[PDB]
Amino acid sequence: ASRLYTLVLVLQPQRVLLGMKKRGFGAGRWNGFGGKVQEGETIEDGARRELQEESGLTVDALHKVGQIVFEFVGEPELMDVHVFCTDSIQGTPVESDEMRPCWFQLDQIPFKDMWPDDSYWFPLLLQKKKFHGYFKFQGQDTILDYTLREVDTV
Numbered sequence: 001a002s003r004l005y006t007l008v009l010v011l012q013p014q015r016v017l018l019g020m021k022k023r024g025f026g027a028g029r030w031n032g033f034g035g036k037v038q039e040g041e042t043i044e045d046g047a048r049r050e051l052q053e054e055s056g057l058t059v060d061a062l063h064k065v066g067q068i069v070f071e072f073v074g075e076p077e078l079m080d081v082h083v084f085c086t087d088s089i090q091g092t093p094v095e096s097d098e099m100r101p102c103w104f105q106l107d108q109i110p111f112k113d114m115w116p117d118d119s120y121w122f123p124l125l126l127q128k129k130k131f132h133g134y135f136k137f138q139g140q141d142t143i144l145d146y147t148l149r150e151v152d153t154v
Protein backbone atom coordinates (compact mmCIF):
# COMPACT_ATOMS: atom_id res chain seq x y z
CA ALA A 1 0.00 0.00 0.00
CA SER A 2 2.39 2.62 -1.36
CA ARG A 3 1.73 5.15 -4.08
CA LEU A 4 4.39 6.82 -6.24
CA TYR A 5 4.81 10.63 -6.12
CA THR A 6 7.44 13.04 -7.42
CA LEU A 7 9.07 16.09 -5.90
CA VAL A 8 11.20 18.42 -8.04
CA LEU A 9 13.46 21.20 -6.73
CA VAL A 10 14.79 23.83 -9.11
CA LEU A 11 18.14 24.64 -7.53
CA GLN A 12 20.43 27.34 -8.99
CA PRO A 13 23.81 28.32 -7.44
CA GLN A 14 22.38 31.07 -5.22
CA ARG A 15 18.62 30.37 -5.20
CA VAL A 16 15.82 27.80 -5.18
CA LEU A 17 12.36 27.91 -6.79
CA LEU A 18 9.43 27.14 -4.54
CA GLY A 19 5.68 27.31 -5.11
CA MET A 20 3.04 28.67 -2.73
CA LYS A 21 0.38 25.99 -2.75
CA LYS A 22 -3.01 27.63 -3.16
CA ARG A 23 -5.51 24.76 -2.96
CA GLY A 24 -5.83 21.45 -1.11
CA PHE A 25 -3.08 19.31 0.42
CA GLY A 26 -0.26 21.46 1.85
CA ALA A 27 -2.00 24.76 1.02
CA GLY A 28 -0.38 27.85 2.54
CA ARG A 29 3.10 26.32 2.39
CA TRP A 30 5.96 26.83 0.00
CA ASN A 31 6.44 23.44 -1.69
CA GLY A 32 8.61 21.81 -4.30
CA PHE A 33 6.81 20.89 -7.50
CA GLY A 34 5.30 17.42 -8.03
CA GLY A 35 2.44 15.05 -7.49
CA LYS A 36 1.20 11.55 -8.35
CA VAL A 37 2.80 9.41 -11.00
CA GLN A 38 0.18 8.22 -13.53
CA GLU A 39 -0.39 4.98 -15.49
CA GLY A 40 1.67 4.99 -18.69
CA GLU A 41 4.48 7.33 -17.63
CA THR A 42 7.84 6.76 -15.96
CA ILE A 43 8.65 8.40 -12.61
CA GLU A 44 10.90 10.94 -14.40
CA ASP A 45 8.18 11.70 -17.04
CA GLY A 46 5.74 12.32 -14.21
CA ALA A 47 8.21 14.73 -12.60
CA ARG A 48 8.66 16.69 -15.85
CA ARG A 49 4.91 16.68 -16.44
CA GLU A 50 4.04 18.09 -12.99
CA LEU A 51 6.76 20.76 -13.16
CA GLN A 52 5.38 21.93 -16.53
CA GLU A 53 1.77 21.88 -15.27
CA GLU A 54 2.50 23.75 -12.04
CA SER A 55 5.10 26.34 -13.12
CA GLY A 56 5.18 26.29 -16.94
CA LEU A 57 8.84 25.18 -16.92
CA THR A 58 10.46 22.41 -18.88
CA VAL A 59 13.99 21.20 -18.28
CA ASP A 60 16.96 19.75 -20.06
CA ALA A 61 17.79 17.15 -17.33
CA LEU A 62 16.55 15.88 -13.95
CA HIS A 63 18.83 14.28 -11.33
CA LYS A 64 17.47 11.78 -8.76
CA VAL A 65 18.64 13.02 -5.33
CA GLY A 66 16.49 11.13 -2.81
CA GLN A 67 13.58 8.97 -1.85
CA ILE A 68 11.33 9.69 1.12
CA VAL A 69 8.49 7.59 2.46
CA PHE A 70 5.68 9.40 4.32
CA GLU A 71 3.15 7.72 6.50
CA PHE A 72 0.12 9.64 7.72
CA VAL A 73 -1.71 8.32 10.82
CA GLY A 74 -5.12 6.97 9.72
CA GLU A 75 -4.19 6.73 6.01
CA PRO A 76 -3.89 3.32 4.31
CA GLU A 77 -1.52 4.32 1.47
CA LEU A 78 2.07 5.31 2.19
CA MET A 79 3.50 8.07 -0.03
CA ASP A 80 6.69 6.95 -1.78
CA VAL A 81 8.30 10.21 -2.98
CA HIS A 82 11.11 10.32 -5.50
CA VAL A 83 13.00 13.65 -5.18
CA PHE A 84 14.71 15.24 -8.21
CA CYS A 85 16.67 18.41 -8.67
CA THR A 86 17.68 20.50 -11.64
CA ASP A 87 19.67 23.65 -12.59
CA SER A 88 18.94 23.55 -16.39
CA ILE A 89 15.55 25.25 -16.66
CA GLN A 90 14.09 26.42 -19.98
CA GLY A 91 11.55 29.18 -19.78
CA THR A 92 10.42 31.56 -17.07
CA PRO A 93 8.23 30.31 -14.21
CA VAL A 94 4.60 31.43 -14.19
CA GLU A 95 1.65 30.97 -11.91
CA SER A 96 -0.72 28.06 -12.38
CA ASP A 97 -4.07 27.33 -10.80
CA GLU A 98 -2.26 25.18 -8.20
CA MET A 99 0.92 27.10 -7.40
CA ARG A 100 2.45 30.58 -7.33
CA PRO A 101 6.22 30.27 -7.97
CA CYS A 102 8.90 32.46 -6.34
CA TRP A 103 12.70 32.39 -6.03
CA PHE A 104 14.38 32.31 -2.63
CA GLN A 105 18.00 32.99 -1.83
CA LEU A 106 19.57 29.95 -0.11
CA ASP A 107 20.10 31.91 3.12
CA GLN A 108 16.39 32.97 3.15
CA ILE A 109 14.62 29.62 2.67
CA PRO A 110 11.28 30.05 4.44
CA PHE A 111 11.44 26.90 6.58
CA LYS A 112 8.77 28.06 8.98
CA ASP A 113 6.22 28.16 6.15
CA MET A 114 7.20 24.80 4.61
CA TRP A 115 6.42 21.18 5.39
CA PRO A 116 8.33 20.40 8.64
CA ASP A 117 10.26 17.45 7.08
CA ASP A 118 12.02 19.98 4.77
CA SER A 119 14.08 21.29 7.73
CA TYR A 120 15.64 17.81 7.98
CA TRP A 121 16.45 16.81 4.43
CA PHE A 122 16.94 20.13 2.60
CA PRO A 123 20.42 20.53 4.03
CA LEU A 124 21.33 17.17 2.43
CA LEU A 125 19.98 18.36 -0.90
CA LEU A 126 21.95 21.63 -0.59
CA GLN A 127 25.15 19.67 0.06
CA LYS A 128 24.59 17.48 -3.02
CA LYS A 129 24.18 14.32 -0.90
CA LYS A 130 21.80 11.58 -1.97
CA PHE A 131 19.43 10.33 0.75
CA HIS A 132 16.73 7.95 1.97
CA GLY A 133 14.17 9.16 4.46
CA TYR A 134 11.07 8.09 6.32
CA PHE A 135 8.62 10.36 8.18
CA LYS A 136 5.55 9.44 10.20
CA PHE A 137 3.12 12.36 10.50
CA GLN A 138 0.04 12.93 12.68
CA GLY A 139 -1.94 15.30 10.45
CA GLN A 140 -0.04 17.99 8.56
CA ASP A 141 1.97 19.61 11.38
CA THR A 142 3.45 16.86 13.65
CA ILE A 143 6.31 14.42 12.91
CA LEU A 144 6.03 11.45 15.31
CA ASP A 145 9.01 9.43 14.01
CA TYR A 146 11.66 9.74 11.37
CA THR A 147 14.79 8.23 9.92
CA LEU A 148 17.26 9.74 7.55
CA ARG A 149 20.48 8.51 5.96
CA GLU A 150 22.91 9.24 3.14
CA VAL A 151 23.05 6.67 0.30
CA ASP A 152 25.28 5.90 -2.76
CA THR A 153 22.39 4.77 -4.92
CA VAL A 154 19.02 6.50 -4.63
Ligand SMILES: CSc1nc2ncnc(N)c2[nH]1
Pocket (backbone or CB within 6 Å): 007, 026, 030, 031, 032, 033, 034, 070, 079, 115, 117, 118
Ligand atom coordinates in the same frame (compact mmCIF):
# COMPACT_ATOMS: atom_id res chain seq x y z
C1 LIG B 1 3.78 15.20 1.52
S1 LIG B 1 5.05 15.58 2.73
C2 LIG B 1 5.82 16.80 1.76
N1 LIG B 1 7.01 17.35 2.13
C3 LIG B 1 7.31 18.29 1.18
N2 LIG B 1 8.37 19.12 1.12
C4 LIG B 1 8.36 19.93 0.06
N3 LIG B 1 7.41 19.99 -0.89
C5 LIG B 1 6.37 19.13 -0.83
N4 LIG B 1 5.43 19.19 -1.78
C6 LIG B 1 6.30 18.24 0.25
N5 LIG B 1 5.38 17.29 0.62
